[PDB]
Ligand binder design. Sequence first.
Ligand SMILES: OC[C@H]1O[C@H](O)[C@@H](O)[C@@H](O)[C@@H]1O
Ligand SMILES: OC[C@H]1O[C@H](O)[C@@H](O)[C@@H](O)[C@@H]1O
Ligand SMILES: OC[C@H]1O[C@H](O)[C@@H](O)[C@@H](O)[C@@H]1O
Ligand SMILES: OC[C@H]1O[C@H](O)[C@@H](O)[C@@H](O)[C@@H]1O
Ligand SMILES: [Cl-]
Length: 414
Amino acid sequence: HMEIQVLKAPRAVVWKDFLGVNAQFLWFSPERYNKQIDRLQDLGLEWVRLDLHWDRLETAEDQYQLASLDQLVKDLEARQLKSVFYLVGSARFITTAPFYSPFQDQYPPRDPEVFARRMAMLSQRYPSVAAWQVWNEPNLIGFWRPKADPEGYAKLLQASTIALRMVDPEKPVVSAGMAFFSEMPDGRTMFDALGHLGVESLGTIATYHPYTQLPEGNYPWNLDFVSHANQINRALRNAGVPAIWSTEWGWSAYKGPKELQDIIGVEGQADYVLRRLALMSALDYDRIFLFTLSDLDQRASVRDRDYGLLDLDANPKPVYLALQRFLKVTGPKLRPADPPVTEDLPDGSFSIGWTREDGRNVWLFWSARGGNVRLPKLKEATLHDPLSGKVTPLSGSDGLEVPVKSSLQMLVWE
Ligand SMILES: OC[C@H]1O[C@H](O)[C@@H](O)[C@@H](O)[C@@H]1O
Ligand SMILES: OC[C@H]1O[C@H](O)[C@@H](O)[C@@H](O)[C@@H]1O
Ligand SMILES: OC[C@H]1O[C@H](O)[C@@H](O)[C@@H](O)[C@@H]1O
Ligand SMILES: OC[C@H]1O[C@H](O)[C@@H](O)[C@@H](O)[C@@H]1O
Ligand SMILES: [Cl-]
């Protein structure tokens, strides 16, 4: 046997349009988040996704805390960023939580119309915001207690969608990012259940958060990320969604102790993010958002502190430097293409071809078992390792010898 996963994107990818980042700007001073934005702009990116928690913005009924958010929205416009905000959680006055429950905000609102009016208020207050997203991961108990409720979420989404379109009928409404591939504890998927409730008629953007242990799946013997993504993306297109985003994905560089995610460190983070980026940019997403722009302080859980492209001082981590090298090699826009002709590409390889703006071909490739591959048609090419920054001219009188790594490499050829 011999199995290779080849991907070819369905359309051209323009990184500025396609690749955004999650951010947690309200956690930081304007001085600090403006530095983060400097680093983001240096990558040639402009899309950001920010979280709003209702119980932090409205601390009692009609008592708001918006000074920081007001300033942030002005600063985001001043930096020419394109933003999507999601609102999640119940304010204390409207929550369905039992009086004694420790997780008051993790319950949905008693009245979806009250939530909807808040989203409308925010949208009218901040017309520069590019898109509004309704709740977050409702297929997870931590965001919708005491148990997943597709009917309940559909009613919330419908009410919010109506209110948001009253404010601006042309602005996109984004449904909640579903955790993983939208699976619920009962064995159903939220996307399927919402489909039966006719939610696709609302015309909201569909999004999910396909975190996996490895870039290409959860186990080395079951690398089925591409299979799952293709399956859910096809179903969503079939349902007639206006667009598909992935509003969260990524890995933490935390040193532990282990909580869900294996310890991989700053170098593992760089490796995994680049491989996953190579996969998702060749799948049928209209936009994706890396989680996340910056490391966070002790207000975040141990794992959640280290997903950043940047450390707490807003300085590059290895994943940033790797992504920066990667995007410099690709240039700003990639058009779908085929990989070069190969001889003895190793079993397990991933293989993705593109052409960049100057017409040169770009081949993205890796394999868990490493090894070597021969390219019989080529006499010269340039090999890039975005993790080390090593650049190697390759040459041959009648074909190239190319080393294969477990990490992504980029071959630029003609
Ligand atoms: O709670 C974490 C952190 O994120 C929120 O968006 C803001 O309300 C901050 O003031 C808060 O400290
Ligand atoms: O907010 C990011 C959050 O995403 C999902 O809910 C999970 O994969 C967690 O692994 C992760 O921390
Ligand atoms: O099977 C792969 C997996 O197995 C072990 O538990 C650990 O070594 C992990 O770091 C590794 O990724
Ligand atoms: O937890 C992540 C955090 O750890 C330490 O505090 C420092 O190295 C920071 O720069 C880094 O962002
Ligand atoms: Cl170019």
